[model samples]
Target: MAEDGPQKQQLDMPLVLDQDLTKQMRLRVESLKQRGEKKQDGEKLLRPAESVYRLDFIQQQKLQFDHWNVVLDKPGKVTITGTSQNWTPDLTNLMTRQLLDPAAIFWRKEDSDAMDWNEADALEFGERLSDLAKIRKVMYFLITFGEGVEPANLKASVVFNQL
Candidate 1:
């Protein structure tokens, strides 16, 4: 490695590093894991039962939950309840509403500056977090009001209707 910094040395496009090659290899492995072929030596054409296709109301809800990328250990139903004391003033700011993202911190709201990160760094990282979330899973929120609270706060909760 040279003593010069990358900015002075690497002005134009640099040579491809291991990261680029490794990512391509990994993606090829990922593609190999799933194949579209169905099982058959010579089969079918012996109709027995009639199955269903269109789903009902409760089934529809579960389908929507699947679309949201939710995970459950076993088969059951779940619920989410988002309550914000100040809807107009709070949620409009984006950050306040995004606090329900399941990966956000809450201590900052109380103004205690204990450091896992500096405020500016944390703010910048939120963008990265949002993008990382796209690869991880989906989140769903339904707006509601906080009970017995002023109209300037935010809250969200989950309730699982287990089976």
Candidate 2:
């Protein structure tokens, strides 16, 4: 192969590291080292940031935030703040280390009756009332919580900006 040509064909070859677990770890470490080398070299050519800080990657610690709380004071306005170490500071729309949930909106509860939220299985829930389709202002009693977006104590969680 060495005597054949000056250029070798660039193609992917699979490395079987099944029996040897350490082989893949070594491979991963080598890959990371190669990545770090390239990154360091590239950052050197970029800007003053590389030379400005006299600190290594480990010494250059980043600020970590925790236990976020969101509150909507008025319409189209929200306040989201978090705590890091001992300081509870304004995160300022900084969403990080995200966790997810399946429930979008859940029924408040039913002392009134059986309530179901988010496409709930209800047997003929909609009963037709008087004054067919002509109404200026109407009231809806059911409260469907807007997951994390809903406030703790708020009257009329669901309301119409009646026209």
Candidate 3:
């Protein structure tokens, strides 16, 4: 079935490759030319618009990163969803890659067995949590565009414990 208006418009587009693949294509094209393949003076592969490319790229990368996904429906609007057996480094890594604020990342975790962690365990996992908070802060701070911005301005709603 087909719908009308914006939804229809969004559906009528081509899928795009991410930066990694785009770079690879360029390198391959150059290699082909070196191997005697002829090319026009201004020949180049076209890339999708940034907005279109980013939405798809971020989703794909996060899925591959650790079975987690972050989606940007539009600029300044993001949703972080998905599950992973190990969320620390994976979730942290994904969040760090994007310009999203900590508040932008959301999740709910459950443990049926009600597991517990000792001091040593807490220390180990605590380090990861600290790293996540620190990285997220820096990332958010870098994207801020004001002189009066404080560290709190970039604070993320990181809930590393409940999960």
**Candidates' TM-scores?**
0.16, 0.15, 0.20
Looking at model 3, residue 151 earns an lDDT score of 22
The candidate maximizing lDDT is: 3
Candidate that beats the other on TM-score, 2 or 3, i.e. the better one = 3
Name the weakest run of 10 consecutive residues (lDDT summed) in model 1: 46-55
The segments of candidate 1 whose C-alpha lies over 4 angstroms from its true place after superposition are 1-118, 139-163
Give the alpha carbon lDDT tens digit for every residue of 1-163 in model 1.
5466543221111111122333444464456459733424322221111111111122211221111122222222222233233432112433433444333222221243321323354355445534433443432233222223232222222221212
Worst 10 residues of 3 by lDDT: 58-67
lDDT per residue, candidate 3, 72-134, as tens digits?
Answer: 222232232221224332133333334222322222223322222243533444345344433
Q: How many backbone clashes does candidate 2 have?
A: 0
- Where model 3 places Cα greater than 4 Å from the true spot, the runs are 1-17, 45-163
What tens-digit string does per-residue lDDT give for candidate 2 at 38-101?
5432221211111110101111112111111222322222211112222211122212333111
lDDT of each: 0.29, 0.24, 0.29
Clashing pairs in 3: 102-156
